[PDB]
Amino acid sequence: AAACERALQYKLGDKIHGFTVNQVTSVPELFLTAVKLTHDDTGARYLHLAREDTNNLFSVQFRTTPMDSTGVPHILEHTVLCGSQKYPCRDPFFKMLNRSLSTFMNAFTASDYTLYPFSTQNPKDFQNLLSVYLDATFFPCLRELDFWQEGWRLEHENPSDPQTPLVFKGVVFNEMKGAFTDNERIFSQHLQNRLLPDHTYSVVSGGDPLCIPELTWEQLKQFHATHYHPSNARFFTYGNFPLEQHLKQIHEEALSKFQKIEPSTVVPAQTPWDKPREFQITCGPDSFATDPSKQTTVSVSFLLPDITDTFEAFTLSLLSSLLTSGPNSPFYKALIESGLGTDFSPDVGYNGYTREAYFSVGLQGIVEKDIETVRSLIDRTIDEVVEKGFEDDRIEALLHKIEIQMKHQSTSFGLMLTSYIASCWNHDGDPVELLKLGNQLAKFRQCLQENPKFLQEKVKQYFKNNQHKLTLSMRPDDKYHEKQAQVEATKLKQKVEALSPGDRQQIYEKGLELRSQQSKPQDASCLPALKVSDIEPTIPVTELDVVLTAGDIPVQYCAQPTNGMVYFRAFSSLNTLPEELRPYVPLFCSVLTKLGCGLLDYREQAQQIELKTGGMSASPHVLPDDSHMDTYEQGVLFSSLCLDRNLPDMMQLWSEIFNNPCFEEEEHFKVLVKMTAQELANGIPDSGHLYASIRAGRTLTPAGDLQETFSGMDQVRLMKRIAEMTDIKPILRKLPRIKKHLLNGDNMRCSVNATPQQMPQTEKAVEDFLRSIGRFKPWQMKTHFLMPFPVNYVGECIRTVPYTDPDHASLKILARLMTAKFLHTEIREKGGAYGGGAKLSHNGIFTLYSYRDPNTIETLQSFGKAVDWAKSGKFTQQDIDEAKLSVFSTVDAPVAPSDKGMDHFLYGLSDEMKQAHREQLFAVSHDKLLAVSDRYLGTGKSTHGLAILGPENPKIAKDPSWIIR
Fold first, then answer.
1. Active site: which residues?
2. Are 302 and 459 in contact (CB under 8 A)?
3. Which residue numbers belong to the known binding site?
4. Which residues pair with 799 in a beta bridge?
5. Which candidate, 423, 493, 501, 919, has a CA 20 to 30 Å from the CA of 394?
6. Separation of first and last alpha carbons in the chain
7. Catalytic positions
8. Phi, psi values for residue 506, rounded to 5°
9. Binding site for Zn(2+): residue ranges?
10. What gap in Å lies between CA 425 and CA 307, rounded to an integer?
11. Euclidean distance between CA atoms 201 and 218, whole angstroms
12. Which residues contact 348 (CB under 8 A, 6 or more apart)?
């Protein structure tokens, strides 16, 4: 039933579809089995990580090592995604998201590799996306006109007048123009180029605008045939789907058509310098800065070993973070707090994307006279670090942070694994050694416990005795870009002079054919797509067991491969709370865990939180019932995170928070309240449509009113009013009353997510923790918030049926239909708004929203034409298939193991209820959609709510049906 148990049955030397198993390793601490295969005929490497995670991932990696600054892998990456041999339609990438049930689809271009990852949860969707990716990457139609479109071309300023002079055009060409107006990209690029001047890292891999137009179509085709060949490729697969199907697809679709070649793509070692060097560069003066004489940037860079030696790379990365990350670092206190500059230099810290990594530090925003002062200060700082070493708490905090960031469970775990092994794997390294994190942590801890001067001798060797130092300074000149334009125009004249009139007519006619290609709407019906039969009918059941303990508090344990992590959550009701103290609970939850407990002041408390746990947070939640519009559960969610070994320390911290919260620390409290108020106040536009949908829905259901009090605009205004008061003490007296009504054990329930091997110790620690703690008529309203915004935020809510009603699925499918085919086109293309759609919440509120719309009345008019369109039924059965595909992409969205299962613990939705709602999503038909659109969305048939956040609108101000607050 598990993945790694059957994955351990793969023996070494087994031949599967042309591949040979070379290595199989069980990684019990990571709940996965790694399998290394190579195709005998082609030489392609294959790595399979089998882990019981439904988000299956494929990734393909190509080693592209350019030998000039023409930009061939960036232009080639843009060009291969424009069409393939079996799928000649344009842009499979963008035209394959609407036909798949994918959760992720992108592409990456690093300095020395290109990466094409995708992820999906449906095995037939995996087969389809795997076939389209193999055909797009390995067999693209590489048409010359696409190379003229994406790369570089000569084009008239008006394509219909062939008498105007010719200029250079291209998308990548102007991308690189905009790359080299940026001073930061010039600084980083020149740092990398001067620091590694021997081989491929010395050039501009993205393309320098003056040397890019020397690339021909034939060189691009030859580069694609040599580097986009399976012998120069790395294949990656992750997840629980049967391995045999993937290998059978790879062999029968791609690898059989190729033969073995030998890629001349190995990156040689950087030859070490004997003496440090200095260089001076020039840039363009920026207009956002306020002082022009103080715009010089300087940096100091050191050469580090290769990433191949895993141990030394991990320790030097840790050392570089210890030296540069955070305001407690030596170089921060030496440089930032000196008042010499404004921020760190670009690429500051550890840079591990190249084969040989490099470390960089420096300052920006200094006067040019201070260069030798800065260099001497950095040298003295390195001397002080050699002389004093590091304190033990900072080393423990860093090792605990790296252990958590590697072990913490995200929803896109496979993406973190492929991004974490791509750089090492690109230069023939062993990716499994990066996975055995326990071994490297153990070896580092042993090397510190055995030799107290380990880190000081490392800092000495790589910083004081390292002669491969580069000091690079940059100062702006006001006529830099005009000089660049002059030399580019000179290269332009040099290239245009050689054209014959027949060439000029060929360029003109190709320009007209290119304009037709860029204008003509084309068809994408040749790509495969999923139907309502390839979607799994039932979900795999999630195993739970509820154990009542001490003596009637339910505690839910869910055994999951959480990767050595224990996640504790507790939910305390608000039924006992007096109604006056309700609006102050967001403040309470945001400050409960930040003022200190017992014998620890707030700084030591924060140090303990960062050193023992992964974070402890509290947030209010309003959980509606799924079967009654006027029933909801209100409470506060306590959430925590820790490693397995630090669990009793975390529960002791929770006992001290529950029994002795420090409601007397007022000085730090004023800082915290001003900081949360400023952070919430600056963030109003970015979540404006959320605040509008919460305000509009306050008057429709009790849950909406409670959501407005807990997380609406009323909470922001109240928090700002409290944060502007000079005497906070009468507010501070309200917090012990909240402690006495919330922090008790009468109406509590808890949940625990942990590994199955940890479960009995967790049951003991949790029971000890519980023994250590004490024992409607809707009505319309219109509101306009006068905000100094340049854009608007509109929200309309409609009252519909709850989750368990069979009509809920029809309302949800109709909502997704309306989003995909009416409101998106009408508001976006015509209106011009940046975002716009419709949403249906779990409680039964049908919510309409608009994001950055320049109009107001036109939004309501598009609402009237949209409900008219929805009642008209003018959509085909293919729209129903696309809406079903999108809704199953939304409701079956992946949940991380740290939230599996969260819905049962919070909202009380069983697997039976989800299966019933899934069969209701299956049973929706076109005529039932016509019935429900004619029954609920029509005017006067249901209750509406309106709210608008945005700037002054005079016509709305003269509307008596609007209330201004």
1. 77 (proton acceptor), 150
2. no
3. 74, 78, 175
4. 845
5. 423
6. 59
7. 77, 150
8. -65, -40
9. 74, 78, 175
10. 10
11. 24
12. 299, 324, 360, 361, 362
